[PDB]
Amino acid sequence: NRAYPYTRLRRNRRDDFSRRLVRENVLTVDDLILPVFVLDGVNQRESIPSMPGVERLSIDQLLIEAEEWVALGIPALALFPVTPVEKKSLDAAEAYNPEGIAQRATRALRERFPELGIITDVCLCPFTTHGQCGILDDDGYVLNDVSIDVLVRQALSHAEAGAQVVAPSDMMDGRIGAIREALESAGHTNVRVMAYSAKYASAYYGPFRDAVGSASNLGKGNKATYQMDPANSDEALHEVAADLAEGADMVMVKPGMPYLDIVRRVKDEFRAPTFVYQVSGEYAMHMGAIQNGWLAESVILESLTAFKRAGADGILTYFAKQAAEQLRR
Amino acid sequence: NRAYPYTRLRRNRRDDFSRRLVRENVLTVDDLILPVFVLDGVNQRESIPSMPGVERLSIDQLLIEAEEWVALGIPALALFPVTPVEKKSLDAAEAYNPEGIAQRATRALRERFPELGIITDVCLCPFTTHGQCGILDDDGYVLNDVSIDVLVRQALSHAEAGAQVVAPSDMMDGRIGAIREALESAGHTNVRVMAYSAKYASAYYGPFRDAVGSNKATYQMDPANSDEALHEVAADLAEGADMVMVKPGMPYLDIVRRVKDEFRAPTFVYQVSGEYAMHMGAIQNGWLAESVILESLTAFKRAGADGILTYFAKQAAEQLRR
Amino acid sequence: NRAYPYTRLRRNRRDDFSRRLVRENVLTVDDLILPVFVLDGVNQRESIPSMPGVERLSIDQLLIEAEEWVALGIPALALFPVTPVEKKSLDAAEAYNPEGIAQRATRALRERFPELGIITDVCLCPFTTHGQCGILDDDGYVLNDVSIDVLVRQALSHAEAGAQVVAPSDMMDGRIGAIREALESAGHTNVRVMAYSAKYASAYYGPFRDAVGSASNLGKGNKATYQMDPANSDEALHEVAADLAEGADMVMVKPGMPYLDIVRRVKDEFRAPTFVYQVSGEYAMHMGAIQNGWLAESVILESLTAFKRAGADGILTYFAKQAAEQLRR
Amino acid sequence: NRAYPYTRLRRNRRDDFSRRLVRENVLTVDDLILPVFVLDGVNQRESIPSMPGVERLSIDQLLIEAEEWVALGIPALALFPVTPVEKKSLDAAEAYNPEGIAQRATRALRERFPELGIITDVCLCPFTTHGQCGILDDDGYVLNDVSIDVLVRQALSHAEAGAQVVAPSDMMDGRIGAIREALESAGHTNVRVMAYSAKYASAYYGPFRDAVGSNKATYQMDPANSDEALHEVAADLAEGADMVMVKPGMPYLDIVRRVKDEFRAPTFVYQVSGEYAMHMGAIQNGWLAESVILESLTAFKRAGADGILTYFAKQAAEQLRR
Amino acid sequence: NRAYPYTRLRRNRRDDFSRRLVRENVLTVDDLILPVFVLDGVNQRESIPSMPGVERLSIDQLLIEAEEWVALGIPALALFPVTPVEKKSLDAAEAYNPEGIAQRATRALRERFPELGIITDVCLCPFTTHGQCGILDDDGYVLNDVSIDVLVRQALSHAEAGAQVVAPSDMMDGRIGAIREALESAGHTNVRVMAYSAKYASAYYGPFRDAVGSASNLGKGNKATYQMDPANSDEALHEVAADLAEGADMVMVKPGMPYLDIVRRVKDEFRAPTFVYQVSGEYAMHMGAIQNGWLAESVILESLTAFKRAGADGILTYFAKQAAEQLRR
Amino acid sequence: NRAYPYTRLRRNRRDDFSRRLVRENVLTVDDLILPVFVLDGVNQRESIPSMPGVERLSIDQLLIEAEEWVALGIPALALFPVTPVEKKSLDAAEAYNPEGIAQRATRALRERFPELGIITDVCLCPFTTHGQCGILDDDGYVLNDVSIDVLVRQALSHAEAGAQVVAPSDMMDGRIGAIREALESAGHTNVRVMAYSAKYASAYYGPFRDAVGSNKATYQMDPANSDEALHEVAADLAEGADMVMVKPGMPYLDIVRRVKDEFRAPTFVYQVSGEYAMHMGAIQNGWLAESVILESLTAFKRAGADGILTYFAKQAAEQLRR
Numbered sequence A, C, E: 001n002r003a004y005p006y007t008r009l010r011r012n013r014r015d016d017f018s019r020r021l022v023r024e025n026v027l028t029v030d031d032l033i034l035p036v037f038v039l040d041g042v043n044q045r046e047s048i049p050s051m052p053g054v055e056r057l058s059i060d061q062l063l064i065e066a067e068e069w070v071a072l073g074i075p076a077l078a079l080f081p082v083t084p085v086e087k088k089s090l091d092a093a094e095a096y097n098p099e100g101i102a103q104r105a106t107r108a109l110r111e112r113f114p115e116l117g118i119i120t121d122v123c124l125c126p127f128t129t130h131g132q133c134g135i136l137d138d139d140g141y142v143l144n145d146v147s148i149d150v151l152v153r154q155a156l157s158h159a160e161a162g163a164q165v166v167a168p169s170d171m172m173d174g175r176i177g178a179i180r181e182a183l184e185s186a187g188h189t190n191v192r193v194m195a196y197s198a199k200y201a202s203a204y205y206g207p208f209r210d211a212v213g214s215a216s217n218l219g220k221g222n223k224a225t226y227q228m229d230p231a232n233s234d235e236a237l238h239e240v241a242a243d244l245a246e247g248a249d250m251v252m253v254k255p256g257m258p259y260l261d262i263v264r265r266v267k268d269e270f271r272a273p274t275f276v277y278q279v280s281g282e283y284a285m286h287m288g289a290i291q292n293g294w295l296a297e298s299v300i301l302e303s304l305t306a307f308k309r310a311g312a313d314g315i316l317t318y319f320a321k322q323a324a325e326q327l328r329r
Numbered sequence B, D, F: 001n002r003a004y005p006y007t008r009l010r011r012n013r014r015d016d017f018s019r020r021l022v023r024e025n026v027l028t029v030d031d032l033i034l035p036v037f038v039l040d041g042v043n044q045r046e047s048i049p050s051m052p053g054v055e056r057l058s059i060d061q062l063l064i065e066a067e068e069w070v071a072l073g074i075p076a077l078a079l080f081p082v083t084p085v086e087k088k089s090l091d092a093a094e095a096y097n098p099e100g101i102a103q104r105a106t107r108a109l110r111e112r113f114p115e116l117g118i119i120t121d122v123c124l125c126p127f128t129t130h131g132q133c134g135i136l137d138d139d140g141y142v143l144n145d146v147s148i149d150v151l152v153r154q155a156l157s158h159a160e161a162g163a164q165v166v167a168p169s170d171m172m173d174g175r176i177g178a179i180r181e182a183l184e185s186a187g188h189t190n191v192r193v194m195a196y197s198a199k200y201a202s203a204y205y206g207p208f209r210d211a212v213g214s215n216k217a218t219y220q221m222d223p224a225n226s227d228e229a230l231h232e233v234a235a236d237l238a239e240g241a242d243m244v245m246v247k248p249g250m251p252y253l254d255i256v257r258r259v260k261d262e263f264r265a266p267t268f269v270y271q272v273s274g275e276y277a278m279h280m281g282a283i284q285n286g287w288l289a290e291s292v293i294l295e296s297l298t299a300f301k302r303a304g305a306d307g308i309l310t311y312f313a314k315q316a317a318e319q320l321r322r
């Protein structure tokens, strides 16, 4: 077998040209999806202290910023509405309002940038008073199938708005198949479904809850009855297997860097289009450190390259614009 | 053929007791290795700007703190000496000095806490004036085999100091074999070698450089590369490593998983200074809860590590003790 | 490859700290399920000569003992009723009596210890005059589908009583799917089904039959037309595959130590939550030897560690309390 | 259990943006190696009838063109000397001449473009009067081990000329090991060996023979054979190859795929002169669009090559630069 | 392991007899399928400049040429009609005309050469004014399921004409299963379906479009919304898996030589009858080079041997007659 | 998820043309090796009672028949000498006699038919007075390493006679390595070694013993054993075998399949004398049709053999020539 000194693995590392020739993975703009927090109103722009460099944008402002995103070649945006407090309810009806932020935003971006992919978020958590991803029963448990009925209405409203991709982020069992059935019935033949398949009950989501405004709603609440236990890996494969059987066109792991092993297993086992979410707390961690001068800016591309190496096709990342700028070089 | 609604994966999630029964991985104190930066003087600690909460410790201070580490059940420490500048050189001779910080610290700990594992760092980077992990040729290239010769002498001095484990962190080709041969030939039959097998040229290392007081793409691995890590580990195991390590850690969990799956050998991971600093800074800014520490360490276990070198070891152990 | 003396596998064994660092498996209280034999009546406690240290307990006494079990962190109990002789019948109707021991016990423990998992036993063998796990036809054969109908009524009665888990221990073909269908229809969405998937026709069950009082009923009778032939391993994988397809949330091998290879194959092949039953005769064997001074008490944890190493997530064991005490340490 | 119509594989195909997101492989300039035929004189180029658009270049001409190659980001060139007839012989001595074309070209390039990789060809076929890749016995059989001895001397001369990679294309058994040993023994520690591991006796080579100015079934592999290619690569890797190559290319993509999957090692492929000529002739006749060039090179990536030796390298790189 | 010089892999190569003994693959006439372009009319023969040596043939002329093809042992022909311009339409109705070229041709060859396999082409592209493989909606998108309805009518018309094999080359999702269902319903129990499973959106098809006369129709148009992205390999396995589930008797990769890795993966993964199409541009490339004297004629058999080695059972190739002649030797 | 009636496996069976297209394996003349029993005299043949239709042939008779074998395309013969009794001994010296039958036959064939492969039998069993495959100790045990020494000398004499392949049939441990080393050391670089790797102690051998004019459970394998065959082949390949063989054949097709799948190496199978006699006797009694011959040989191909040693080779080749 390979043995020193006949094999010296430093030889390929000796020069840039050979490191290039043997380099196993490369990040390109084709791998990047930009999540964006969308405000109601006009000429609104809000900094998020726990996500330095990220702004919530009203739709007019989103349209302006999207010019450069498109110019940079970023394939898709993932939209997250910042729902006004008074539009939150127990029944999460705003989720399917044709005049909801997500729906208005989608329509606006679809008209303005016909080639830009818009991935909407299918979940009730921006819409509930309690901040849970589904509807609660009288014991305070997030009901599975009752929640799916609302998610289905939501997803159809997104498809009606022109979204090319809906991304159910809710972790109810069976929701992919229910959404697929409804889209197919309704003639939304080519609306993709990007399932959040292995989405963990994680501490890395804090900043997002602040960004979208669910943090105050959820309070100290937890999602361990639906989001996955961080300890578990084999279980992720069963989650993905179900979602592919149910018709997902893409499957996602969330969070990201703390779960690269799950990305790798999922790509290896299913050989399907595999996505990963570099979550708010990941972005915040890195930004915090960069701004303190503790880590060089080169960590950005290293973090994103890791997702490629681990087997992701596409990466939802708040660093998408900076990454794409650096890639353009 | 598991399918909704016959299969509802939420059933097991419904209650704590069923989550606990099916829980696939559990971090324990047996998984933790505490890295520590060791100063030369007496009655001294220094704070590290880029590593909030971590202190460089003189040996007397190290012995005081190790009393609590041992009481918490932490199995081992990884020592990193902070070499005084005056002792740095081109030839890295201080690395094998019998009275160098690492050697002194090792002797003092082995005597006070005989059951505590001591993992020394076998590398020239704390000892070179230029801070590269090996000896430079006249073009500034880190010479492989000449570097090994120094590493070997270093490793022997650690064994003589009583280290139970030496950990070559240098990424020279072939060093694990060289060091093993030397140890065996010297009668240090039971000194373990914890190879840093897949160590990447990473931006996540900056804070550790500030900590120890110390451009490596010709020896450390390209972050893009995964298959190559398997070839690295294979060689190290062939060469006699008792344990193999991936570094950095979280940014490389896929590597951990592949390594464990491929070789079924004792597998370690280093949650490096950058990973610590990013997490602790976010926790301190109030952007992330403290629970992220155990989540990050659980990830290593899930990914297949047996042990984790982490600056959170004490905090984690305390939380486990609850 | 790895060769002596470059590789000396004693090096990691040289010290406790390194044995700890490399130790591949660890038993925790999270792995333990306590089976308990439950009597009718009040203030009843009965020693079982063939299970030294084990008592059958009336429900009041069970409630008292369960205080310490909970205090010790044991996640779940598995209940086995000791059915009064006169309540045994050909039709096993007591199996679904809402006032049966198992049902009363379940209700009592669910109220008193809301977080404690209760796993009920779905089988007709405590209820038949003949001691077989199903209903007999006129040739004395245990009818498959007729027995399932009774098992379904039983399982529903358990769910109605509040059990979080029902565990069909009967080995009829297809019963998992029938029970799942009935639970789903009835709205018992989150009642787990712990299938006894690979349950062998074993000699190690003797003491249990004495403990629950089926021994006198079964007499010299055998279960080779439904329980699996000890010789067979590949067949266990087909049993588990069916039960997972039919909706089991967990799958079990029984007995345990004499079948660790089956545990290993089952975990490796399916990557599903895998349980194992350290049966009465296993417990008795070990206790007998410990009390004779032939084996040290350390054999307890070694036996349980073996299940972890072989791939079990959870272990039904009469040693659960002692184990948990030792773990608490 | 993916099934229509829940699964419709056209959904991802519906839009450019989703095609791009799920696109499994992407050719980049980092994948390209440009082979070049090098003439002996000064201020000279020659057109090659069977390779439209490819020119033989004198070294001064090579240096001019390499300026654009380097600007386009092409990582490396593969040099093939066009040996003047007068310098051919039975003993192939010209192969290790310090002033042979390959050596001269290597020195000139290493000096002008220090970052550009130079891959020399280690083989006797440009040097033998008979054009076989090795030294003939009196029955016309290409002697294995006697040939190796010449190849070794050749390889050393290339290392001395500063080649970063030597590529034995000769298909003698055992040569990779012999050459590695020689390089190591001479102190050329970092010279890579790119073994032509699975090189077939193929009809696709004709045009290259016209290009260089140079019946091989006793050494080159039978096109029918696939398992045998794995045994070839295994030996080469054991023997110290840093990279392994399949040749020809497109007609052997299944070989590329198996090799990559089996060994997870740096894998290269040669789109040979015939493959080039067939494509360029069809493109010129107007029978195939220019887009076939990138399609053919994308295939190599999909099949698992890390790098591709291709006469289209410049054209491809230019198109990538868009 | 195997090491030089104990192992010298040249030894088996030393002599023809040992190369023969160890030769891993051999091409035979049993592997060859001859595609043929079929004209309307009588006594028509047309050379195709971009496919030197290939002629379009009216059916009388096809019948004459088929004598030698049969004499040579070629198992099957694949028919491609050259539809008259004026019979092209938006609705592609000519596709199912019982008096269409393909149908007439099939009937003629089935009567004359009862043992010769006839594989008809199921696709709408020879029949549409726009040259796309399906029916367009008002956005110019090739509608999936509406196109299948036409393909089904087409395939049934072929079966009625006596074709033993229909080969859907259209790349609509789900068409294999729809065609299979229709054939089964109609009593065409033994009509094979040779699915073009992994058919890529390739530049190598140019000459065929000229040969059949779709080139002028398609113009600069592309098929990237249905034909596969050349970059993608894992996706081919999902395409084949679906087609086998849907009832394909054979599966095909197209193009061929530029996709041999896909052939290999497909054979290895499914162990099913696997076919590959050496497309017009492949044939043209090689012929061009042979006629220029750049490549020896021996490249023909080398190219075809490659398909065998890569795992194909059968090869659609314009070189079939020459190959078969050489094989006859 | 293939299921009736969407999947009907009879569709492909419906017509000859589709059966031919999907047909997974095809016997060709390239797969056939003809074993032949060679007598010492001149102008002589002998019929073998237990092998109807097979004749022992003097060398002049062998040369006459080989003309048709060569015309039929049979690639190689396997020679088995029928040693005159007077030349048998305890020390098996006749095995390496330069004028022994095998050597004479080899020279005569190599000269007349230079393209025909000649596979000689390396074993002592035609040469020992007791008919065991090796040299006996005083307890009647077949000595392993002492036997090898004779086999080696035998093998060298065959190489000197011009055999292209030597086939050790002896089942001594380690002989393949010993023989390879000897051949290489003597300069017989290209002599192939076709190891009888998995050769079973079988009842199917009786007729061959009558044919050659020659209780083996201490060297030949137990018919019960399959995993053990993999270990046998692994060693032989490590030791330098160019080809590996299973013997007997049909009764061991599962072994062929495992061997091919595990090692992907050139794999051979011997349809032994018993297998021939059972088939030919049934064919002659009219109990089985002649078509069983091609069916039996097709089985070997399906099972994964590259080549088949069969007494039906001529008949098969003739049928193939149709």
Ligand SMILES: [K+]
Binding pocket: A020, A021, A022, A023, D030, D031, D306, D307
């Ligand atoms: K590359």
Ligand SMILES: [K+]
Binding pocket: B020, B021, B022, B023, C030, C031, C313, C314
């Ligand atoms: K557990």
Ligand SMILES: [K+]
Binding pocket: B030, B031, B306, B307, C020, C021, C022, C023
């Ligand atoms: K551990």
Ligand SMILES: [K+]
Binding pocket: A030, A031, A313, A314, D020, D021, D022, D023
């Ligand atoms: K991508």
Ligand SMILES: [K+]
Binding pocket: E020, E021, E022, E023, F030, F031, F306, F307
């Ligand atoms: K053969």
Ligand SMILES: [K+]
Binding pocket: E030, E031, E313, E314, F020, F021, F022, F023
């Ligand atoms: K075939």
Ligand SMILES: [Mg+2]
Binding pocket: A171, A172, A173, A174, A197, A239, A242, A243, B009
């Ligand atoms: Mg799910």
Ligand SMILES: [Mg+2]
Binding pocket: A009, B171, B172, B173, B174, B197, B232, B235, B236
């Ligand atoms: Mg290394």
Ligand SMILES: [Mg+2]
Binding pocket: C171, C172, C173, C174, C197, C239, C242, C243
């Ligand atoms: Mg069952």
Ligand SMILES: [Mg+2]
Binding pocket: D171, D172, D173, D174, D197, D232, D235, D236, E009
């Ligand atoms: Mg070779």
Ligand SMILES: [Mg+2]
Binding pocket: D009, E171, E172, E173, E174, E197, E239, E242, E243
């Ligand atoms: Mg398809």
Ligand SMILES: [Mg+2]
Binding pocket: F171, F172, F173, F174, F197, F232, F235, F236
């Ligand atoms: Mg042997």
Ligand SMILES: [Zn+2]
Binding pocket: A123, A124, A125, A126, A132, A133, A169, A170
């Ligand atoms: Zn949500």
Ligand SMILES: [Zn+2]
Binding pocket: B123, B124, B125, B126, B132, B133, B169, B170
């Ligand atoms: Zn260092």
Ligand SMILES: [Zn+2]
Binding pocket: C123, C124, C125, C126, C132, C133, C169, C170
């Ligand atoms: Zn029972």
Ligand SMILES: [Zn+2]
Binding pocket: D123, D124, D125, D126, D132, D133, D169, D170
């Ligand atoms: Zn050559």
